Write a protein that binds this DNA or RNA. Structure first.
Ligand SMILES: [Mg+2]
Ligand SMILES: [Zn+2]
Lengths: 1110, 147, 48, 49, 49, 147
DNA sequence: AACCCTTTTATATAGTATTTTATCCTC
DNA sequence: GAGGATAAAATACTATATCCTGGTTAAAGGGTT
RNA sequence: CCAAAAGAAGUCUUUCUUUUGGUUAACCAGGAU
């Protein structure tokens, strides 16, 4: 609606949306440009948090400096991080295997505290990787993505449990810091508030309380209101700061010398010092908020203070007593309650910037350690900042982050939606998070605080279910990492347009209504009773006077992938989850087609995915070609956009781009100027519209199978292009001189026909499995000083000619044209990894059609492999002779509760034939609220039904009742939506009408060509002589432990013996059985498997005398 | 009983292995932390891949190459010491390392219940102190001379 | 086609929960790359 | 001890068997499968074999 | 596990509202996670038996 | 006493002696079961047991040299302790103390780890195997077939 | 200026089994 | 008041279905040749 | 057990003789039923 050039897609939406969807990649870009401190982020923070704008690098450096020795006679400080221009643009970085990064310079200043001689320098701090405009990093040529992590916020967490013996409540607290020790108070069977400092052992709270310097009289003066505390104090045991300190010291130190002052050195070092204990800003904020401590003042320091600990103890005791509100001196009163660790006010988000910040922090920590170790050894009055700065740890940390982390993953580039969804992912598992095989069912559930902040539908189906989710459409992240949502605030029953962003707690306090509520054109609800959400997520009917807020719209709780399923409210959650997860597996097809019935989210997702070319500035087109577009801006300047033609993606698909503008058209800023892999004029198009019938047919569409027409193969409707990449390199080696050449030993000429004058195959030459792509030979080694031979090489001049052809061969089960050859070389001063002289890369392309066993799917979780592909003549055809394209089985629809597809089918037909509502004498009742411009549509019209505000059943029925004829005065589909089909195979009409329509089906990336495999004999493993595994080598199918029980149950002993002896690892039985088969003899008897002898040797290697008797 | 096994099989007895049995299995001693020479791609001598200890790396060939034919069999080269035979013997011949000081077996010490402790009636803590050189132990005391 | 006549072949689908997860069938050549399974054994294999 | 070692707790089973010097008679279905013999069930028993 | 007293009052033919769909997702995900854990446990139990 | 009598009677009834718990020689598995293979570019792929054997042999040779050369008892005890730890890491890595890690800060596989777990010898290689004359593929519906 | 050696706190529970240790009972 | 006996807690070890594919496999310092 | 080279015979392309050469693992991640 706002894009300059967009297709006109009419919508059934009734409501109006006050807020336009934000930038879908804002999370990544706005969390990175904070790390570097760009001017754009500074401006954004100015209109919000101008009090203290400081980037991540500034924070790390100013937490690091000053670096001083023990004597305090010299200091080193850092300041003013600075970035230069990127070394090379994105395309060159991706082409030449160059990481995309920019130089980093900082100002290192050294000051001598006994001479006043200052030495300032600009020190180079390494090459810092930079984020592209699409939210991806480019590391070693590959495009990687850093995932956001859901972690538990640091702070104080109270909780309650029940004891088996006492049968009474037991309360506990825990102060979990960021990079610090833990102190856990609690209350057990006999009333004894007990600390567990640093998870060592229980003690009375009085010991710690006194160690801080509190008199027993003071202890009973303040905490003298709980029987628990009075009992603990009156029976504590010891008294005196030194005595309690010594007790704590014994508890902490493992029988170390009981030095009194060491007690302080530990007590203050572990908690109150600002080097080993940190709460960060989020931790301090949460602690202050929970305990109602100093609020007016802002953050000034983050380290535990005695006031916080004593307030925590008071909070715990009062919670155990039964009170419901507390006030601490010098602070506001706060309610007394337990805390839930699954609440979204307690689960914060570490984004791409805050994750890089931690690695830079550890790198700077190692640099500081090296600096303060080198400070003393290097002579004084000879020290300059350049000398002490060891940069290797920092670059090592930055380099090991983006190669060996579970939060930095290869971008999923199956299609634009795959990448777009990958960038907006929140993973609960990773370094610092839970594990996939250790998490219970209480963390995989959907908390009622996720509404609008994380989609409840989209999530993995396997064992990751609940641990990985996707950020909702309108959600953002505030500075502390807590996700927010926009709400439209209602004042005195008047629904204003003041959008306010709230987090989980604020939403908890207030009452929130629904977006799809009867607004009466003046911001006033029609009826007083409207569904609302109360504090704990309870749903109730409240009179329309207590409501505080409303949702900005429906479609606020769903993510990008789930917002593209039409008629979502008619599908069950189980099927909607599958339908959403299967839209990111669809393969890009050669020719794309946008759906007839969508949801209006396709355009925005396509534009924000970044797979299209958008006119940067308005102008007029000068030249258009399949390779480039030239745009003449209004003021002289001309800009040329290049196209990605047949480029491979991370998952082996095609990445075509084609212009959609003419040589005379005038473009406008923000307009789409070139399509992408899965786009049709700027809108996402993952599949095709097919004419579908819903009948069972001869049992070929039995048990989730599908039947297709042969037309879809003849017309290349579902054809796709796949590209494979092969690499080989030349390396020095100690022997030296690895060469790429045609001269290969033991190779004839018929197998060297395609190779060109210097090895590599020719472009356009079709290859088969086993062929050679790059000829390469390496030294045979085995340098042997044979008298006659060696004396000839030395003086006579005989050459070595020791070669071993380690050529590049196309692996098993591959073929296709060679479309691209990219050859590097050390001669042309190309940048290669050390010790590599040459690098050759060959691309092989295949064009795959749809075939039996290929996996298809719709948008409603209706998957299924292709059972059969019938010829065009023997398919059910309409009265006018039109065959149907696909047949789906009836029995799967009503049982799985995804009736939405049927609705889509119906609407598809009305979108295909076109309709015209006859408002001759008043518009019909059912079309009373149907937006004008929908009272008539032309054939092949494109409509849209937003996810939770769309076409009603009455409107669908009405539209079905009035629809245009095809060519003559024939209406093929009646008012019920069903048409009379003819049996194309026997000729007789089917006795009853069938449901026909148009459905949008996609082609999943689970093709049979990659699944089929067979083996008779082949490679065998080395340690144990069992066959290999996998299709690439050859390998055999595993005959596991569970398949052996079935054979034993059958009683088949000989089959099991032959399977486990002469088919897997009887080294002589294999050859003997092969010879017996080829010679027609009887199969011989098995021997002993080799793995048993390997086991005996392994047991003997453990000093166990395993012997076999007789 | 059967050594390499021809598949007539009565029992599979297991037991502890004494140093004498360990030296009986071994065909030689490994006394050098060398694996392969990366200039001729041939195993080092007295290393973890020594051809004299574990056998030839190629069918019917010795280290010095004085013998390369099938006619030579079961004869140990007097120069290199490698026995001329098939290469599969490299899957069957074991070595041994002669420790300069005794060492305990972890299975019988760390594993719960500590079976060295039950045999000697020592708690795991003190036993761990003794074997890792953190405390002394009185291995004998003479009562006749005592009083 | 002369060789495979009356030569059984064992078909198996994992997980093999029970005995009838492995069954012997007489093979017959077909066009395509997918194995064709009789509809009445799907309950035994538990194979949709 | 072979079947027990292959079921669970390989280390504990192996160490206690070594201490006890246990001898295995190879009479179970699992042991015969491990050592590559004909299981004593169904078609592998003497009556039919 | 306790019932929501609301309750959901629309059939999937008419189409649920936003809140009803949200409160349905609870049971949906509970069932899926239960299924996964159940298949794992059944495999282990059969192995022991 | 009941717990102790188990091991005591175990060592009493049989002719074996408990002395097998304390080692004097360490056996070395044949090379073919811990192979190192050539990856193109002059690279080698070790078996992860060569590292542990080299760690044992280095300490053993160092201790032997320090004993023959003569040295104070403290250094000899330290070397013997490190040899004990090296042998323990060889037989069962990580059971006591910090696991010995190779490149990438990943623990090494000891001899015990070859037999324990779902990926151990017993369960993975002896009870189940990969076999010849096998294929796999996607299944479709065959309504025209006989049962 | 290039080899050889060396070395580098948490989202889990559930079940059982053995060693402290801490306190209570008995003489 | 001292010693033995029994609860308690405190740690130590074991286990958690099947199958497939794709990306990596060290650097830094000291001593020596 | 395969590949390359040379020699002989015949067939118009197979056989015989001699020489040379001639397979991995472990982790992490992502999917499927
Ligand atoms: Mg299935
Ligand atoms: Zn020799």
């Amino acid at each position: 609606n706002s894009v300059p050039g967009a297709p006109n897609r009419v919508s059934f939406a009734k409501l109006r949306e006050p807020l336009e969807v934000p930038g879908l990649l804002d999370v990544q870009t706005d969390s990175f440009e904070w790390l570097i401190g760009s001017p754009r982020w500074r401006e954004s923070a100015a209109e919000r948090g101008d009090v203290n704008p400081v980037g991540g690098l500034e924070e790390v450096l100013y937490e690091l400096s000053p670096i001083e020795d023990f004597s305090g006679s010299m200091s080193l400080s850092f300041s003013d991080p600075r970035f230069d221009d990127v070394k090379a643009p994105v395309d060159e970085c991706k082409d030449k295997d160059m990481t995309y990064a920019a130089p980093l310079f900082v100002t290192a200043e050294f000051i001598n505290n006994n001479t006043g001689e200052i030495k300032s320098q600009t020190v180079f701090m390494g090459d810092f990787p930079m984020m592209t405009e699409k939210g991806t990093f480019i590391i070693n040529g590959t495009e990687r993505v850093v995932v956001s992590q859901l972690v538990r916020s640091p702070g104080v967490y109270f909780d309650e449990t029940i004891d088996k013996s006492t049968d009474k409540t037991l309360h506990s607290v825990k102060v979990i810091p960021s990079r610090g020790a833990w102190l856990e108070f609690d209350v057990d069977k006999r009333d004894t508030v007990g600390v567990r400092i640093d998870r060592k052992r229980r003690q009375p709270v009085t010991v710690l309380l006194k160690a801080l310097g509190w008199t027993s009289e003071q202890i009973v003066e303040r905490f003298g209101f709980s029987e628990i505390m009075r009992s603990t104090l009156e029976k504590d045991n010891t008294v005196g700061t030194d005595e309690a300190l010594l007790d704590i010291y014994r508890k902490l130190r493992p029988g170390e010398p009981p030095t009194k002052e060491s007690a302080q050195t530990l007590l203050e070092n572990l908690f109150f010092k600002e080097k080993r204990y940190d709460l960060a800003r989020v931790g301090r904020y949460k602690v202050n908020k929970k305990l109602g401590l100093h609020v007016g003042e802002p953050i000034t320091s983050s380290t535990l203070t005695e006031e916080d600990v004593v307030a925590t103890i008071e909070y715990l005791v009062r919670l155990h007593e039964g009170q419901t509100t507390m006030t601490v001196p010098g602070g506001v009163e706060v309610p007394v309650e337990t805390d839930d660790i699954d609440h979204f006010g307690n689960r914060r988000l570490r984004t791409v910037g805050e994750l890089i910040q931690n690695q830079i922090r550890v790198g700077m920590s190692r640099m500081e350690r090296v600096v303060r170790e080198r400070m003393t050894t290097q002579d004084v009055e000879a020290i300059t900042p350049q000398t002490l700065i060891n940069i290797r740890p920092v670059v090592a940390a930055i380099k090991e982050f983006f190669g060996t982390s579970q939060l930095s993953q290869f971008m999923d580039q199956n299609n634009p939606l795959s990448g777009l969804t990958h960038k907006r992912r929140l993973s609960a598992l990773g370094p610092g998070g839970l594990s996939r095989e250790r998490a219970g069912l209480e963390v995989r559930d959907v908390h009622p605080s996720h509404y609008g902040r994380m989609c409840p539908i989209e999530t993995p189906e396997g064992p990751n279910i609940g641990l990985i989710g996707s950020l909702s459409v309108y959600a953002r992240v505030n500075p502390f990492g807590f996700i927010e949502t926009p709400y439209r605030k209602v004042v005195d029953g008047v629904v204003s347009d003041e959008i306010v962003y709230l987090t989980a707690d604020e939403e908890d306090r207030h009452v929130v209504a629904q977006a799809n509520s009867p607004i009466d054109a003046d911001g006033r609800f029609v009826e007083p009773r409207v569904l609302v959400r109360r504090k704990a997520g309870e749903v109730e009917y409240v009179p329309s006077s207590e409501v505080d807020y409303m949702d900005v719209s429906p479609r606020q709780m769903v993510s990008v992938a789930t917002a593209m399923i039409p008629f979502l409210e008619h599908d069950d959650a189980n099927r909607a989850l599958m339908g959403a997860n299967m839209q990111r597996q669809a393969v890009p097809l050669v020719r794309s087609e946008a759906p007839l019935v969508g949801t209006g989210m396709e355009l925005r997702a396509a534009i924000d995915a970044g797979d299209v070319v958008v006119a940067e500035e308005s102008g007029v087109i000068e030249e258009v070609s399949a390779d480039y577009i030239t745009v003449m801006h209004d003021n002289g300047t001309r800009r040329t956009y290049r196209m990605r033609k047949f480029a491979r993606s991370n998952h082996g698909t095609c990445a075509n781009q084609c212009p959609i503008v003419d040589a005379g058209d005038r473009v406008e800023a923000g307009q789409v100027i070139a399509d992408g892999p899965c786009t049709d004029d700027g809108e996402m198009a993952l599949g095709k519209n097919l004419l579908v019938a819903i009948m069972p047919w001869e049992g070929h569409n039995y048990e989730d199978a599908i039947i297709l027409s042969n037309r879809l193969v003849e017309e290349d409707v579902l054809t796709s292009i796949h590209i494979e990449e092969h690499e080989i390199d030349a390396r020095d080696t100690k022997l030296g001189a690895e060469e790429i050449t045609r001269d290969i030993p033991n190779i004839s000429d018929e197998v060297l026909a395609d190779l060109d004058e210097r090895g590599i195959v020719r472009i356009g030459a079709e290859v088969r499995d086993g062929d050679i792509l790059v000829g390469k030979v390496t030294p045979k080694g085995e340098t042997e000083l044979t008298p006659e031979e060696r004396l000839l090489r030395a003086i006579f001049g005989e050459k070595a000619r020791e070669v071993r052809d380690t050529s590049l061969k196309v692996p098993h089960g591959e073929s296709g044209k060679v479309i691209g050859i990219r050859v590097f070389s050390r001669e042309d001063e190309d940048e290669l990894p050390a010790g590599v002289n040459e690098l050759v890369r060959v691309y092989v392309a295949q064009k795959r059609k749809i075939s039996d066993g290929d996996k298809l799917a719709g948008r409603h979780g209706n998957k299924g492999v292709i059972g059969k592909i019938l010829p065009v003549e023997d398919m059910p055809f309409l009265a006018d002779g039109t065959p149907v394209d696909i047949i789906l089985n009836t029995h799967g629809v009503p049982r799985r509760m995804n009736i939405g597809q049927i609705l889509e089918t119906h609407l598809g037909w009305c979108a295909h034939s076109g309709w015209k509502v006859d408002a001759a004498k008043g518009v019909p009742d059912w079309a009373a609220r149907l937006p004008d411009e929908l009272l008539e549509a032309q054939p092949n019209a494109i409509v849209s039904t937003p996810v939770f505000d769309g076409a009603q059943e009455a409107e669908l029925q009405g539209l079905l009742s009035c629809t245009l004829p095809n060519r003559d005065g024939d209406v093929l589909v009646d008012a019920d939506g069903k048409a009379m089909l003819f049996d194309g195979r026997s000729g007789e009409p089917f006795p009853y009408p069938v449901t026909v329509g148009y459905m949008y089906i996609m082609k999943l990336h689970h093709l049979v060509d990659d699944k089929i495999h067979a083996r008779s004999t082949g490679p065998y493993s080395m340690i144990t002589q069992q066959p290999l595994g996998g299709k690439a080598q050859f390998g055999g199918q595993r005959f596991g432990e569970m398949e052996c029980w079935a054979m034993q149950a059958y009683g088949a002993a000989y089959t099991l013996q032959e399977l486990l002896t002469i088919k897997s690892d009887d080294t002589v039985g294999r050859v003997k059985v092969y010879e017996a088969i080829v010679k027609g003899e009887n199969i011989p008897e098995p021997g002993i498997p080799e793995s048993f002898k390997v086991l005996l040797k392994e047991l003997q290697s453990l000093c166990l005398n395993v012997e076999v008797l007789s | 009983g059967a050594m390499l096994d021809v598949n007539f099989f009565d029992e599979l007895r297991i037991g502890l292995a004494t140093a004498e049995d360990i030296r009986q299995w071994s065909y030689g001693e490994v006394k050098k932390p060398e694996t392969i020479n990366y200039r001729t791609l041939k195993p080092e001598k007295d290393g973890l891949f020594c051809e004299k200890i574990f056998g030839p790396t190629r069918d019917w060939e010795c280290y010095c190459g004085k013998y390369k034919r099938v006619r030579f069999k079961g004869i140990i080269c007097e120069r290199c010491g490698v026995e001329v035979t098939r290469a599969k013997v490299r899957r069957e011949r074991m070595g041994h390392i002669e420790l300069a000081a005794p060492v305990t077996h972890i299975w019988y010490f760390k594993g719960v219940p500590s079976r060295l402790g039950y045999l000697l009636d020592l708690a795991p803590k003190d036993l761990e102190k003794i074997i890792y050189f953190a405390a002394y132990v009185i291995t004998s005391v003479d009562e006749e001379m005592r009083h | 086609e002369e060789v495979i006549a009356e030569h059984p072949v064992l078909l198996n689908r994992a997980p093999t929960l029970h005995r009838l997860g492995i069954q012997a069938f007489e093979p017959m050549l077909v066009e395509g790359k997918a194995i064709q399974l009789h509809p009445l054994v799907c309950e035994a294999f538990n194979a949709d | 001890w072979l079947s027990a070692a292959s079921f669970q707790e390989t280390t504990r089973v192996l160490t206690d068997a070594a201490i006890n010097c246990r001898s295995d008679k190879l009479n179970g279905l699992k042991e015969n499968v491990i050592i590559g013999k004909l299981i004593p069930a169904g078609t592998g028993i003497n009556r039919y074999r | 596990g306790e019932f929501i007293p609301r309750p959901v009052k629309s059939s999937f033919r008419e189409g649920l509202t936003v809140l009803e769909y949200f409160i349905n997702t609870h049971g949906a995900r509970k069932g899926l996670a239960d299924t996964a854990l159940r298949t794992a446990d059944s495999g282990y139990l059969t192995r022991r038996l | 006493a009941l717990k102790r009598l188990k091991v005591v009677a175990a060592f009493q009834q049989s002719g074996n002696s408990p002395m097998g718990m304390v080692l004097d020689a360490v056996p070395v598995i044949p090379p073919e079961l811990r192979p190192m293979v050539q990856l193109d570019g002059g690279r080698f792929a070790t078996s992860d047991l060569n590292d542990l054997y080299r760690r044992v042999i280095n300490r053993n040779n160092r201790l032997k040299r320090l004993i023959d050369l003569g040295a104070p008892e403290i250094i000899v005890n330290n070397e013997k302790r490190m040899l004990q730890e090296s042998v323990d890491a060889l037989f069962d890595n990580g059971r006591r103390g910090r696991p010995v890690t190779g490149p990438g800060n990943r623990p090494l596989k000891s001899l015990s780890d070859l037999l324990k777990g779902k990926q151990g010898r017993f369960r993975q290689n002896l009870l189940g195997k990969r076999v010849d004359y096998s294929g796999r593929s996607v299944i479709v519906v065959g309504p025209q077939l006989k049962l």
